[PDB]
Design an enzyme around this catalytic site. Structure first.
Site, PDB file in Angstrom:
ATOM      1  N   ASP A  35       0.838  -1.200   0.000  1.00 29.14           N
ATOM      2  CA  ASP A  35       0.000   0.000   0.000  1.00 29.14           C
ATOM      3  C   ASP A  35       0.874   1.251   0.000  1.00 29.14           C
ATOM      4  OD1 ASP A  35      -1.892   1.932   0.258  1.00 29.14           O
ATOM      5  OD2 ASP A  35      -2.474   1.401   2.331  1.00 29.14           O
ATOM      6  N   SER A 199      -0.203  15.602 -12.166  1.00 27.27           N
ATOM      7  CA  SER A 199      -0.426  15.250 -13.558  1.00 27.27           C
ATOM      8  C   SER A 199      -0.633  16.513 -14.386  1.00 27.27           C
ATOM      9  CB  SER A 199      -1.647  14.337 -13.667  1.00 27.27           C
ATOM     10  OG  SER A 199      -1.999  14.078 -15.017  1.00 27.27           O
TER      11      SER A 199
END
Length: 330
Positions: A35, A199
């Site tokens: 994770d 992004s």
């Protein structure tokens, strides 16, 4: 040193991925959810409330000659899906894919919430976010990667998740045969303890690319891709019959649909998520309404590049003095 381990989807939807981990002496092998959005290595154990264990493999510290109680230490964690777990702490030897850390904090669960009990395939979590998020008190503990870093050939790990297929976590090296083209690296903020990056934009299907900054986290422990409501609306508007359902809890679409791809920017590079990766199947057994793999992050407070996005790429988690993320097509 290096390590290399195969990671396997837990079900036919890729709801999560499990990776075998050796704990203790002699080894006890548990299948853990790696994770990158949390920082605790915790396991079902001989200490877990018996009614809360349903098919998982347990760690029994009393059977490990290298286990030592970390006196006074406790832990307690809550995840973004509302699940939680808590307990006490041992140190022990932990190996992943041939890479061994001695003295790793292994957090033994005394209590787990229902969603963990109900998932017989996940024996615990291995956190790979930054150690500043680790919940152990009163002495915070380091992640497996943080403990191994100095010994690794290069201070990196990579995630290569498969679509409906196994994939690989590597530690300490970049497998140049595992991706196409070049790896594009992008800056990371560690201020919230996550692999947080920006992004450069998106496209829906064959549509034109929209240049826009989208801050979010690379999170292998989240199944889906959670993005701003504007972006998610633009995606689902291209799918006839798709709609946001308050009763189901997100966007649903006709199971008869063919989904368009979704592209996200990494610097000047582009990662393309095929449409099929966005199909999470019937909302309930036998339904013709299917659950979408791209959902709104509104109300979560952060955008999440979960498995839907990451499994379309070869992803480098670069833990050099200034961390960065790398993405390549594959």
């Amino acid at each position: 040193s290096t390590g290399s381990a195969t990671t396997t989807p837990i079900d036919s939807l890729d709801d999560a991925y499990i990776t075998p981990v050796q704990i203790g002496t002699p080894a006890q092998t548990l299948n853990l959810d790696f994770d990158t959005g949390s920082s605790d290595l915790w396991v079902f154990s001989s200490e877990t409330t018996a009614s809360e264990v349903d098919g998982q493999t347990i760690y029994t510290p009393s059977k490990s000659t290298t286990a030592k109680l970390l006196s006074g230490a406790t832990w307690s964690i809550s995840y973004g899906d509302g699940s939680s777990s808590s307990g006490d702490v041992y140190t022990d030897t932990v190996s992943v894919g041939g890479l061994t850390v001695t003295g790793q904090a292994v957090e033994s669960a005394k209590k787990v919430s229902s969603s963990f009990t109900e998932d017989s395939t996940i024996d615990g979590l291995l956190g790979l976010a930054f150690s500043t998020l680790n919940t152990v008190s009163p002495t915070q503990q380091k992640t497996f990667f943080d403990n191994a870093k100095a010994s690794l050939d290069s201070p990196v790990f990579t995630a290569d998740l498969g679509y409906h297929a196994p994939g690989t976590y590597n530690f300490g090296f970049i497998d140049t045969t595992a991706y196409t083209g070049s790896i594009t690296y992008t800056a990371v903020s560690t201020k919230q303890g996550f692999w947080e990056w920006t992004s450069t934009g998106y496209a829906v299907g064959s549509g034109t690319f929209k240049s826009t900054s989208i801050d979010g986290i690379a999170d292998t422990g989240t199944t889906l891709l959670y993005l701003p409501a504007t972006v998610v609306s633009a995606y689902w508007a291209q799918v006839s019959g798709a709609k946001s359902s308050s009763s189901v809890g997100g966007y649903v679409f006709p199971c008869s649909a063919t989904l368009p791809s979704f592209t996200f920017g990494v610097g000047s590079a582009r990662i393309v998520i095929p449409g099929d990766y966005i199909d999470f199947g019937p909302i309930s057994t036998g339904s013709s309404s299917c659950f979408g793999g791209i959902q709104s992050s509104a109300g979560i407070g952060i955008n999440i590049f979960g498995d839907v996005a990451l499994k379309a790429a070869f992803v480098v988690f670069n833990g050099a003095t200034t961390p960065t993320l790398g993405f390549a097509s594959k």
